[PDB]
Amino acid sequence: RECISIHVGQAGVQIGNACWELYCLEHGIQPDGQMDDSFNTFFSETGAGKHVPRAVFVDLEPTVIDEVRTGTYRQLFHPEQLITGKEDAANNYARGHYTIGKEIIDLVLDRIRKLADQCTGLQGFLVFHSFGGGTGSGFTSLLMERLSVDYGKKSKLEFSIYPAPQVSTAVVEPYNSILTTHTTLEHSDCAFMVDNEAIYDICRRNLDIERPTYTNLNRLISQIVSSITASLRFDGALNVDLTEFQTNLVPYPRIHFPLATYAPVISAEKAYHEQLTVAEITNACFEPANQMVKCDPRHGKYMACCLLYRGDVVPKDVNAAIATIKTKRTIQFVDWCPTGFKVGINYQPPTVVPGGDLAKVQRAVCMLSNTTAIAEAWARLDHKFDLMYAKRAFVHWYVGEGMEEGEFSEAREDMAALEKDYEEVGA
Amino acid sequence: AECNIKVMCRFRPLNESEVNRGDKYIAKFQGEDTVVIASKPYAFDRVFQSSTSQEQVYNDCAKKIVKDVLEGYNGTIFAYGQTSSGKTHTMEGKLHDPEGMGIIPRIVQDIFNYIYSMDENLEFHIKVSYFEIYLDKIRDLLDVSKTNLSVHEDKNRVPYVKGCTERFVCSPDEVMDTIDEGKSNRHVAVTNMNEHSSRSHSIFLINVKQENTQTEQKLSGKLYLVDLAGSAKVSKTGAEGAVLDEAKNINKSLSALGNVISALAEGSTYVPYRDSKMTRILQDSLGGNCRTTIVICCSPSSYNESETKSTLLFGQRAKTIKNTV
Amino acid sequence: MREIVHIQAGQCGNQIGAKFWEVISDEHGIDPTGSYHGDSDLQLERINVYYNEAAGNKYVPRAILVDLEPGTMDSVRSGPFGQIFRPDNFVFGQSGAGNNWAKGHYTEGAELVDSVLDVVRKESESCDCLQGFQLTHSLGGGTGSGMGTLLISKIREEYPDRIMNTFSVMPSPKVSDTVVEPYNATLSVHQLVENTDETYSIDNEALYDICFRTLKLTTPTYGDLNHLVSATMSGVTTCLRFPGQLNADLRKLAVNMVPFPRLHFFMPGFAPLTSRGSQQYRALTVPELTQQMFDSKNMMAACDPRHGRYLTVAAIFRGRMSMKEVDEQMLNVQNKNSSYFVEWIPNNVKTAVCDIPPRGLKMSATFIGNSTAIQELFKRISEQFTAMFRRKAFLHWYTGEGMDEMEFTEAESNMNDLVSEYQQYQ
Amino acid sequence: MREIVHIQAGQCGNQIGAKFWEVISDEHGIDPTGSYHGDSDLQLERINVYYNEAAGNKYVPRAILVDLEPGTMDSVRSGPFGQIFRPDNFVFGQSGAGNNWAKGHYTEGAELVDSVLDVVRKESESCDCLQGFQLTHSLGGGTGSGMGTLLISKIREEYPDRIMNTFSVMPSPKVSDTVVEPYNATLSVHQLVENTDETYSIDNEALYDICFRTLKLTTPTYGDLNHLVSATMSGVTTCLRFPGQLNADLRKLAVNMVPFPRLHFFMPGFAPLTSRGSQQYRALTVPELTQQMFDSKNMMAACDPRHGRYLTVAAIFRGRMSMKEVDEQMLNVQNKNSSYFVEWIPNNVKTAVCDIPPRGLKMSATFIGNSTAIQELFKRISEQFTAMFRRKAFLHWYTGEGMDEMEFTEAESNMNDLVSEYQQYQ
Ligand SMILES: Nc1nc2c(ncn2[C@@H]2O[C@H](COP(=O)(O)CP(=O)(O)OP(=O)(O)O)[C@@H](O)[C@H]2O)c(=O)[nH]1
Ligand SMILES: Nc1nc2c(ncn2[C@@H]2O[C@H](COP(=O)(O)CP(=O)(O)OP(=O)(O)O)[C@@H](O)[C@H]2O)c(=O)[nH]1
Ligand SMILES: Nc1nc2c(ncn2[C@@H]2O[C@H](COP(=O)(O)OP(=O)(O)OP(=O)(O)O)[C@@H](O)[C@H]2O)c(=O)[nH]1
Ligand SMILES: Nc1ncnc2c1ncn2[C@@H]1O[C@H](COP(=O)(O)OP(=O)(O)OP(=O)(O)O)[C@@H](O)[C@H]1O
């Protein structure tokens, strides 16, 4: 069993440098690149007493590759794997795809090809990017379509960072988001999402970080993305494979947009005063304010859910916990899937970073919930797009790249068809 | 005083690249004014079928404009459509064949034919010019030395071209010779969707000035006959290399035309003609004293459903526009 | 990587350009001789984006100083940092323009443009990858407006894919040190709107207003005014010079801030701007400086933004700070001023941040603003142009160099087109 | 948490406001430079309720000093604690009012109010949660009564939900240092009764009577009078600055002391007030100081309370004390003076206590009193206003600034409405 993880854009590599420091600390791998079958799925054996990750950090702008090369994790990462471009994407879906995209994909597509030949147990893929700009929308979408025609059958786990309703960083983000989702709807088997304002809510009420930064945001992202693959790295009472997220969560091949949320999140001084057992974390993960994406699940219905635990978590009590969740009539499951639960247990506990904001805990859970609650989020994203599309705002840049008004309307009606399906399936 | 911009649709037969793929014929005609595509209406003035020959299109669309442009008013005939829609076949066509010749030879023939029927006192002075857009520069094809021309305004603040190769002509055969020189120097590239992919918006101008010796009344008329390119889908056509740079410039022209034609349909205040230089020379056509007649081109194949529907609503929003004639 | 070729045209352009190389040289830690003495390694990492490696670890700037008089270069060369520039870049004529747009555009510039185009060509080919051109000129005078606009058109046709940055100061009715300023202003904007993809519309009276109210300096000279406008040039080019949590290249700013191709005339700003005595009585935190950026006083243009509405604004922050405070502050400024932001865009505030702040300050931010209030400065130049043009006043000097009055009428039509365009989206 | 924005208008308002920041700075332990040197941790816990955190652990006060002359700020800035205030807050005009209500309300204030409203807006947005406004002004003169009342009306419409505290000194017939005092007094109370929810009616002659009889100082200057009125300002705001067994916010005092919306003109007081030689011959216990608070001598207004009846009185105690002694003392004062308390309210004595007394005293208490005796001071101002108005004396200077005599008649009708209202509940 093995897997490879690529990173795209500023959002990807800032997760990449932040998550791989956590992976090397779990397996006792020092930052200098050295210290049995637990680290094999992410790290290779480099001859004798040395390892290397199976990853590639690619970005068109060189601002982010040079600091990783001259950072503290210089010897851990391979220097040739750190790919750097020549020209910036400039928050344009077209520019990072066609002009700058076409001249660099030939290096990375052949690189990951030969990087798979030394591998033998490639279960799938998981990518890290953000459709809020150009590199994570244009270059990523070109990568997904050219990988699906080559491999196709293998899974792809998309982890994109979407914008909040009112809070945002860019101003032309819905154009990049609506254009790239036209290609991501059919080529992605599953795609987890994260919001930028909701994650601030996680650290505000619970962790009490009144002045957080993107470094603190990525550390709890590392807990999420490492928990889903914790079953493959270590043994457990009920192991779950990476392909389990395709069968048990995707009821239909185009409805593959689940939410995400994680618990417990607690500070140092609060960790010793709060009791930690499976009950409150099962009550807290379904809490609407503790979600990683701004969607009200009370308005919608859950299609599918999967619970994976870590640490000393016995199976007799967690089955009682979900039984209390089913009889709770606050939330409501859909009639098309009454047995909407997938339980998973792992003995390896959650680790902590030296000097990190998160405290140590004997157990944890990662809740990925499939629901129709993202339909109102997409309609709101489409609603704000119609105001700018009617005035032809920010259109002269994209048509100056080579595109035209055709795919603008194709992305609109395709997003309208996505809304037509989520209202039909929720009946 | 005010006349609506007449819009007409022309579908073609399926090309060789479409029938072998297995594209279905979606074009459904309901009379001349209405056309239906996937069970929804699109109203125009006159919709031409695929069996309509070259001469039949000219008799219906650009027949009356020869009388309007010679009476004293201005007139413009330009087409909109994506790649392989049938624009160059409509305007240029094949000149050496009498049947396959397009509009702009038929326009020149009708102008000279009407002059021979008029009395001797009407003195005509026809002078032609021809240029295109390439690498964001106005290149004249009649003279290959100059590569960039500036757009200046006349006395009434109407924009027009300065420095163009203004050739004074006498006989109609000389005009056909310059049209042969125009097509020979035209930079036409090859791609997967159309072998004769014209990568430039070619403008043919005929400044027809006339004066009667008896009444001593002078009249002028600007006759722009434009052949526009089409927005090529890079996923369908595969525009890589230098042709991708050509896709930038031609799409800027029609997207700029999409801005002003939508600004005129909604009825904005500014009407941004200054977005691109192609909108400047087309400024008199859409908002001047010209009797403009757009002719939208569409393909009946199922492979191009999304772009063909965009071309019909491009014409519907053109229907609600009126010129200040 | 992403080299930017600097260019300095006109008297004021050479002065603010000289201050631009002075202030960034202290940020990177460069001596006046040209040797490196910086304290951090990140200063040397992106030193090649403006400078070039030379023998003895010397770093020469890519500054092409152009002027139609020789005395201007003597003051710049004899400055504190005048010895670092290359002698080959100092290319200049003998006869000045005398505040005439026609001389610098047809006669004095045409004989000199062939010499300077060879200088920028060799500098652009020696780089690894060209990003854009950073111009400093003035709409007043003849050498800044006439020749400075002409070289951009030659660079536009030569490099149509590359961006064009222009930090262009322009006159005002209250502070007017030139009689023939509206003719030079009205003719220059006709060339800027078609060629330049970026234009920072700076006003002189606002810099006098900034130094008087918020700074309250006793004796502001031209050198103090250059320190304000030079800091804005260093602030926009921060992301491609030091690392940051959210990088934004100069092209990334263009895609966010240029919603239409002609609406590229912005209203720059800089903060914190405090006096020497009012520094102890102020906190350097992020929420207090944010409201200072959106204030009418801090902006470097005479147009009050409350008379119009913002098209799209950018705030390039600097220094170690909380991203939540930056993300929450940009929300409340547009929420409680929703009348002054367009409803047909859901979010108008672009943002960016860097890790390495300026030397001497812990945190800072630079304001770039696109708004419909900028048309107020154009129409007052227009009515000044129309007042002098309607009786053909001061035109016979322009006609001596072969210039026609039709081009004045064409520039007047473009000036009417500019004010009507900003009124459409208001 | 519950920030209060301070404001100082007029000459006397700046003087008593300057003493207010001086006396509380010693309670919190702040140096004149602005650094903290307090002994207890509770002093720093609620320091943000007036001050703001700055660099170097410096604490700047939120004091907006406004005056229509520049010389007043020079005396305040050159004081002992003048260097702690922010230079940006010192906003002022050039031409004084010359003791004219019309100048400071129509001409001199209107040109300056646009500048000061921007100063209070940024200070109110920077706080965590706004509680109220603490004003110091005088009914005498033009800048205190005219401009000081005008800014409250602008703040009233901007913040209608927030309370408004006004410590307003007013003239008297025995001590009158101004010829045009009743016109300024009669016009100001018309604006105060509709806008201000709280008003501490202080009289100057009572402060002279307090310093003469109970304190028996030899040479009382204006600075000694400011120490008395400044202590009352620090006493009302004690509960939201230090912990206490029974906390009472400034809004909590308003609900208890304002039975009707117009009856918000109170009679403040302070105790203990002892001489230097009579300190050893006195016990600091609670029953002896309580009867001193209800005595006519200790009250800071010329109206004898025995000529009327108390509507509702508040005693904000300070220091470690027995709650039973406080609860039993408030009973006997109203029992044996039941004729001087209204029968249509069962209990008129509000009370509160704090744990941290003032520096230099072990126990203390501050008296706030609502009574019908305050109407005596209004009618003597009314008959002075009616005596000068019935022949149009000294009105032509007011009419120069566009003011009409109808507003004088309207202020006279409101003055008749005030004295009749207090007579209803007597
Ligand atoms: N903020 C600053 N503004 C300046 C400075 N010098 C001039 N100016 C202003 O710019 C206006 C015109 O700019 P210039 O001085 O460069 C005139 P120019 O050199 O382009 O033409 P000629 O000198 O006639 O050859 C001028 O009237 C000033 O208002 C300066 O050093 N700093
Ligand atoms: N208890 C105190 N009372 C004062 C003090 N200064 C003045 N006053 C009294 O207040 C009366 C009027 O108040 P002001 O001195 O402020 C007159 P104002 O400054 O508001 O108007 P102009 O000075 O004419 O601009 C005045 O006649 C005194 O009786 C003081 O320092 N302490
Ligand atoms: N949660 C989170 N989001 C991030 C982080 N870094 C970047 N982002 C998001 O990434 C978005 C921008 O996307 P990108 O395409 O990567 O922007 P870019 O890489 O600078 O691309 P250019 O501007 O064209 O150079 C922003 O809106 C952020 O919200 C991060 O560390 N954590
Ligand atoms: N109505 C029609 N009937 C038959 N054939 C046609 C018709 N219209 C076009 N064609 C065919 O199309 C070919 C010419 O294509 P054309 O040059 O018009 O492409 P285009 O869409 O104009 O390209 P571009 O968009 O680059 O200008 C001719 O060979 C001709 O046979």
Numbering used by the authors:
A (entry chain I): 2 to 36, 52 to 443
B (entry chain Y): 5 to 329
C (entry chain Q), D (entry chain P): 1 to 426
From the manuscript:
By superimposing the global Cα of α-tubulin on the left side, we found that for α1C/β2A microtubules, the lateral interaction between α-α and β-β contacts in the non-seam region was similar to that of α1A/β2A contacts, with the Cα atom root mean square deviation (RMSD) lower than 1 Å. We found that the longitudinal interactions between the intradimer and interdimer of α1A/β2A and α1C/β2A microtubules are very similar, which was confirmed by Cα atom RMSD analysis. In the present study, we assembled α1A/β2A and α1C/β2A microtubules, determined their cryo-EM structures, and found that they displayed similar structural features.
Microtubules are cytoskeletal filaments that play various important roles in cellular processes, including intracellular transport, cell division, and establishment of cell polarity. They are highly dynamic tubular polymers assembled from α/β-tubulin heterodimers, which are arranged in a head-to-tail manner to form protofilaments, with ~13 protofilaments associating laterally to form a hollow polar tube. The GTP bound to β-tubulin at the E-site (exchangeable) is hydrolysed within the microtubule assembly proceeding via longitudinal contacts with α-tubulin, while the GTP bound to α-tubulin at the N-site (non-exchangeable) plays a structural role and is never hydrolysed. We determined the cryo-EM maps of α1A/β2A, α1C/β2A, and α4A/β2A microtubules in the dominantly populated 14-protofilament type at the resolution range of 4.2 Å to 4.4 Å.
